[PDB]
């Protein structure tokens, strides 16, 4: 199957800059190429049909070109309310195999997060389980990377997270690690941390905290 | 002081062309004045980019 | 566009062929398919923008004084023959450029033919615009083709004992 | 034995949309604009002669105006009206006048 | 104008089956093509089935194998999308979109999908879970000092074991919303989904100033609101 | 009219196949020639029908008071404009039917380049528009045509032992 | 202009066939070729030259006193409209010209596309219009292409065993 390879992965751009997203093929699919604005909770909306046109009732502030394999999205015209994940569409032929997609981020200042930690309060170790949470706030961009450590040893498998979505006005980003853990497996061990690794930190910063501590 | 077979109220054009948008009020040799600003006359054969 | 691509490397020219063989590789233009082209687009723009001019004694089309019928009848002509003028303009350079591409196409498809009344036994087309000579064709059989002096009867002893076989 | 002889056209890297009948934009090799979308912004005097009405009209000329004291018996092929002309005499009216101006 | 509404969707467990459809309105549906494509939760979009206005070319993606049966009827003007052998996979949302035919501005002779589908509807929700509806249970965190020369302390309240997606949870009913986030569910290894929620607070205002997080679930009616101290 | 009959029982496209083998008969569309002949069709529409209004202050063109010079001043202007524009539809609508039988032409040309340039050695014309495979065709060769990913160096040693022998 | 030269003793018709055997030479003209191109060539003319004519009240369009601006309207109003109708003249019949160049090569086209049809297997063409047939080609032969009564599986085995050996 061929597989609709873009490049890169995620653009950041402020407003005024001109964005260069890419969507290659493997066959020729110069005039039956269509690209799609993709909104997290909105309906899909087609913006350049056959990589060549606009679509109508689209304004001309986005444009397009490229036929053989190779294709550029450029964007002149980039508005702050026009930030969303676009896609590419193969029409030549079935079956219709879509691509990636490519988030498109505002660029802002990298700042340097605030490591927080939440020990398991008594409403929870009563009914039977254990979660520890390690909340991560005001840090930019999404690639942050953060690990978990029981007793001076690192475990993995077990371990859940939530990304929410960018700030319309301070746009920054929250991350709230989640660990799994059980009534049996919280009273076993005793010291729980969480690691922090930032690209704006110049330490790795974590905190620690005792199973008595509650 | 120049040479020009066509004049026009919005500066002088050479008349080599069929066509014209500068002005409706032409006098002599004047290209005939039209709405329509862009008319790409194709002079060669569809471009065609090579594949690499 | 059925010609995968064209030749960007090639400027001395709007046709043309590439040659690949023993002796190397290049690009030549074609001077026969390439003269008879121009004659056919040249012809196209001398009718069109020479010799096509009305020098006389025109009328007032812009008035600033608003008289009345005698300058609604004058505003309503000059503006059916604008719109005329512009409707032509619509029909004439959107058909020559219609018929471009259709003269270039036909222009390939002489030069496919004048190829093709050459290579009948001795080579096969690829698919790409392209021929598969079944024989050996250094530079003066290339030349050949592209004067049109090519001799049918002479590589046919050749190419047809490697075409079906 | 074997060889390769194909059959193409010139391609631009750098072409231009036309206006065909089938296709609404089309990018060719090379094209022309029929349409003159500018201009010098000066009138030429040659090869026809073109006078220069600074200080008065057509009519201002053929009436007897003193600002126009310099056309005595001048002929001409084009005449240039300004917008900054204005009369200094004694006020007339024409009526019809596109008919005697032209 | 040109809208395209959905319909058929729920809670189904897998193994199940279903009937989508897809009302249109503003067009006549017998002149133009239709299809079906999907949006999974965490991947792209997914093109599953295409049919024509004939009722003759009907094409399948690879994943389909003949497990859904795609219809339409001109009397109607709706679709008929038959859902079966289901699992856990296929949950996502299902959307129909409308083809575009032609490269000009308005398609007077339609054609194929060959340009595109610039026709997109609203959608609905359709989980295959086997798991039925449970009410959440809301867990406290207890804040702590951290940041000694800011002087900040986070605190939220964990919101696990629920069914089914999503909860509205705010602070004070409303009454506190300057630095809330929201985060988004995740899946459990038992199926159920769980989320969090917090708010940058001063620690000046810990023993004084009184955080109720309120959890409210709409098809459950469960209204659990616990204090955060 | 060198195709003999069309195909009443095609009504999933204007162009198709007709294939008939062991595995039964059938009509399928071709998705790829019908498209590009849309393409062509509806752009001769939209810069026609579409977009080519004029909004505009006319004038009064009937008259129940018959005044005299000034009334058959414009009387000649409003004939004239009406017969122009009645013999630019007789010009434009009359060569649009025309081109459209050449577009039809030059797609069924485009569709039989297409199929020549995959059969060369594998097949031959009958001479009502229909192929005769000298090899064995099956549904899935059928669609390797229709979509462009035949094969000419697979089937020729099978078709070459039928065709000359 | 690939056809070298036409056929001058041939005035029994615009298209024909110039046989060549053992029977002797002669030239006859083609039924079926030539009356289809005049259906096209003739209804090209009848709706140009016939019923396009208007019967109307005119206005007067030459002046021996000059009134005014009353005659420059209709001045400017008669010399466009003269030059509108010149520039459709210049439109209109130097396409028709164009498109007859055309017709006639398409006309050939077909008759070289209905020779081309019956003599793949049977005959190959020369370079300047002419068809070297490999088999026996008595007069019963050659007006049996010419009505578009030729078979094809009759002369295989023998022009078969002459065209690649």
């Known amino acids: 199957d061929i597989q609709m390879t873009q490049s890169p992965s995620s653009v950041s751009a402020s407003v005024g800059d001109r964005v260069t997203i890419t969507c290659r093929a493997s066959q020729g699919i110069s005039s039956y190429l269509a690209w799609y604005q993709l909104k997290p909770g909105r309906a899909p909306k087609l913006l350049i049909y056959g990589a060549t046109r606009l679509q109508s009732g689209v304004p001309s502030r986005f444009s397009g070109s490229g036929s053989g394999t190779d294709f550029t999205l450029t964007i002149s015209g980039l508005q702050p309310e026009d930030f969303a994940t676009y896609h590419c569409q193969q029409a030549d032929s079935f079956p219709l195999t879509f691509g990636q997609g490519t988030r498109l981020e505002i660029k802002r200042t990298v700042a340097a997060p605030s490591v927080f930690i939440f020990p398991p309060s008594d409403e929870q170790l009563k009914s039977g389980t254990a979660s520890v949470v390690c909340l991560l706030n005001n840090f930019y961009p999404r690639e942050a990377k953060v690990q978990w450590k029981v007793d001076n040893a690192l475990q993995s498998g077990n371990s859940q997270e939530s990304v929410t979505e960018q700030d319309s006005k301070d746009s920054t980003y929250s991350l709230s690690s989640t660990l799994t853990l059980s009534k049996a497996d919280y009273e076993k061990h005793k010291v729980y941390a969480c690691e922090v690794t930032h690209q704006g930190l110049s330490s790795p910063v974590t905190k620690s905290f005792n199973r008595g501590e509650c | 002081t120049c040479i020009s077979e066509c004049i026009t109220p919005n500066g002088s054009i050479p008349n080599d062309k069929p066509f014209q948008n500068v002005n409706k009020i032409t006098y002599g040799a004047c290209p005939k004045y039209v709405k329509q600003n862009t008319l790409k006359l194709a002079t060669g054969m569809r471009n065609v980019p090579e594949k690499q | 566009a059925f010609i995968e691509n064209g030749w960007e490397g090639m400027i001395d020219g709007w046709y043309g062929f590439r040659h690949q063989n023993s002796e190397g590789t290049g690009q030549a233009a074609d001077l026969k398919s390439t003269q008879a082209a121009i004659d056919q687009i040249n012809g196209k723009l001398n009718r069109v923008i020479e010799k096509t001019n009305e020098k006389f004694h025109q009328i007032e089309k812009e008035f600033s004084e608003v008289e009345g019928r005698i300058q609604d009848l004058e505003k309503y002509v000059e503006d059916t023959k604008i719109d005329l003028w512009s409707y032509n303009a619509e029909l004439l350079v959107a058909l020559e450029n219609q018929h471009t591409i259709d003269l270039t196409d036909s222009e390939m498809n002489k030069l496919f033919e004048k190829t093709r009344r050459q290579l009948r036994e001795n080579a096969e087309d690829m698919g790409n615009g392209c021929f598969k000579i079944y024989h050996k064709c250094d530079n003066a059989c290339i030349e050949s083709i592209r004067n049109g002096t090519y001799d049918h009867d002479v590589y046919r002893d050749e190419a047809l004992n490697n075409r079906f076989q | 034995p074997t060889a390769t002889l194909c059959l193409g056209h010139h391609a631009v890297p750098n072409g231009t949309l036309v206006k065909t009948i089938t296709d609404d934009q089309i990018e060719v090799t090379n094209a022309t604009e029929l349409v003159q979308s500018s201009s010098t912004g000066k009138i030429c005097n040659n090869p026809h002669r073109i006078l220069d009405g600074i200080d008065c009209t057509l009519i201002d000329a053929l009436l007897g105006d003193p600002h126009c004291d310099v056309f005595q018996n001048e002929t001409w092929d084009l005449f240039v009206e300004r917008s900054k002309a204005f009369s200094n005499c004694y006020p007339y009216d024409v009526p019809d006048y596109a008919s005697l101006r032209s | 104008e040109v809208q395209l509404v959905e319909s058929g969707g729920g809670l189904v467990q897998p193994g199940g089956s279903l009937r989508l459809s897809c009302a249109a309105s503003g067009f006549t549906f017998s002149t133009y093509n239709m299809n079906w494509v999907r949006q999974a939760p965490g991947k792209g979009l997914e093109w599953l089935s295409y049919?024509?206005?004939?009722?003759?070319?009907?094409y399948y993606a690879d994943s389909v194998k003949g497990r859904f049966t795609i219809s339409r009827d001109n009397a109607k003007n709706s679709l008929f999308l038959q859902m079966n052998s289901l699992r856990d996979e296929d949950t996502a949302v299902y959307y129909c979109a409308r083809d575009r035919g032609c490269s000009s501005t308005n398609c007077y002779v339609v054609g194929y999908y060959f340009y595109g589908m610039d026709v997109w509807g609203q959608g609905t929700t359709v989980t295959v879970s086997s798991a039925s509806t449970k009410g959440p249970s809301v867990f406290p965190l207890a804040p702590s000092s951290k940041s000694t020369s800011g002087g900040t302390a986070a605190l939220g309240c964990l919101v696990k074991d629920y069914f089914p997606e999503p909860v509205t949870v705010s602070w004070n009913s409303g009454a506190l919303t300057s630095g809330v986030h929201t985060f988004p569910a995740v899946l459990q290894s038992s199926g159920l989904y769980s989320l969090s929620s917090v708010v940058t607070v001063p620690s000046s205002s810990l023993g004084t100033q009184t955080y109720i997080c309120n959890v409210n679930h709409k098809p459950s009616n469960t209204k659990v609101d616990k204090k955060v101290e | 009219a060198f195709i003999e009959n069309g195909w009443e029982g095609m009504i999933d496209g204007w162009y198709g196949f007709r294939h008939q083998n062991s595995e039964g008969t059938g009509q399928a569309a071709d998705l790829k020639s019908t498209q590009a002949a849309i393409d062509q069709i509806n752009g001769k529409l939209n810069r026609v029908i579409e977009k080519t209004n004029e909004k505009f202050h006319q004038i009064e063109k009937e008259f129940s008071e018959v005044e005299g010079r000034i009334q058959d001043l414009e009387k000649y202007v409003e004939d004239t404009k009406i017969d122009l524009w009645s013999y630019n539809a007789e010009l434009l609508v009359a060569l649009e039917n025309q081109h459209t039988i050449d577009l039809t032409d030059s797609e069924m040309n485009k569709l039989f380049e297409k199929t020549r340039r995959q059969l060369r050695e594998n097949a031959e014309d009958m001479g009502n528009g229909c192929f005769k495979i000298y090899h064995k065709c099956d549904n899935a060769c059928i669609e390797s045509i229709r979509n462009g990913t035949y094969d000419h160096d697979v089937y020729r040693d099978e078709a070459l032992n039928n065709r000359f022998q | 202009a690939f056809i070298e030269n036409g056929w001058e003793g041939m005035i029994d018709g615009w298209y024909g066939f110039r046989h060549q055997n053992s029977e002797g030479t002669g030239q006859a003209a083609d039924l079926k070729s030539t009356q289809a191109a005049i259906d096209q060539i003739n209804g090209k003319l009848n709706r140009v030259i016939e019923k396009t004519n208007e019967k109307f009240h005119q206005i007067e369009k030459e002046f021996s006193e000059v009134e005014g601006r009353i005659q420059d309207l209709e001045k400017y109003v008669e010399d466009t409209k003269i030059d509108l109708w010149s520039y459709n003249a210049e439109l209109l019949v130097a396409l028709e010209n164009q498109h007859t160049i055309d017709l006639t090569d398409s006309e050939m086209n077909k008759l070289f596309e209905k020779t081309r049809r019956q003599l793949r297997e049977n005959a190959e063409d020369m370079g300047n219009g002419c068809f070297k047939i490999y088999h026996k080609c008595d007069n019963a032969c050659i007006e049996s292409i010419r009505n578009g009564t030729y078979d094809h599986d009759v002369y295989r085995d023998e022009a078969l065993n002459n065209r690649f050996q």
């Open positions: 049919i024509s206005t004939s009722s003759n070319t009907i």
